[PDB]
Design a protein around this ligand. Sequence first.
Ligand SMILES: CC(C)=CCC[C@@]1(C)Oc2ccc(C(=O)O)cc2C[C@@H]1O
Ligand SMILES: CC(C)=CCC[C@@]1(C)Oc2ccc(C(=O)O)cc2C[C@@H]1O
Lengths: 120, 120
Amino acid sequence: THTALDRYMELADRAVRDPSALAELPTIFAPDATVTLRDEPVTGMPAIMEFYRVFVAAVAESKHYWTTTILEDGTIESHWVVAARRADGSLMTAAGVEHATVDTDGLITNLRNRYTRTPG
Amino acid sequence: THTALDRYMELADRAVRDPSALAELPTIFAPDATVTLRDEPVTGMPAIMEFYRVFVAAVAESKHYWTTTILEDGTIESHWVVAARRADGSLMTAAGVEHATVDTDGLITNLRNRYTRTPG
Ligand SMILES: CC(C)=CCC[C@@]1(C)Oc2ccc(C(=O)O)cc2C[C@@H]1O
Ligand SMILES: CC(C)=CCC[C@@]1(C)Oc2ccc(C(=O)O)cc2C[C@@H]1O
């Protein structure tokens, strides 16, 4: 599928290679969207772009796999996995589920993640 | 580095895409090598080829990252991570450390893995 959450997942690995790919974020998130990956919310495009710049700077190379469903209420859910080499040379894996609220244009207004395998 | 263990790790993902890449295994393992990935040893080229054929059949797509060191005694050690989509559509991650004995030609005579993150 190619929902905004799919487009977001696709971006993840691309932006690690090429961080200027993050200029695509306004085609994924509504402006004034809120994102909570672990514990802290980040709201609005400027803060969202900087949070993801910082995020992808800490990663040397990554690969994500995911599966996406649209729930009863129109919420989008994606189960995902990652493997990566961090910028410090350490290796990591993680796995989780992301839940997105979308607006009538299909862009994400609220993104939440819960880990089923914490990054390690 | 490009030890035989590196070439083994590099083959992993290529063979999931194209299983005929496993004809490269005789350039990685000594004939009569032993491999123990989890609990059961597989010995010799014919058995090793078949074990890996079955292994990569259960995987739709994967990505490994690894780091390799040559220990004091000449044993090769690689820390690795993987993310993958399995042939049943399930997602997985795992992480471990592989230790290889090599022979004088540099081919692996004995390969052993110990998971630090079991497949899940
Ligand atoms: C940078 C971007 C556009 C998307 C990130 C996707 C995403 C699934 O990837 C990771 C990777 C590691 C980690 C980690 O915590 O190291 C967390 C996530 C959740 C993110 O939403
Ligand atoms: C097929 C081949 C040539 C190499 C496999 C490498 C390797 C690191 O990859 C996995 C992946 C999953 C798993 C798993 O158990 O699902 C185990 C391993 C150990 C293997 O040695």
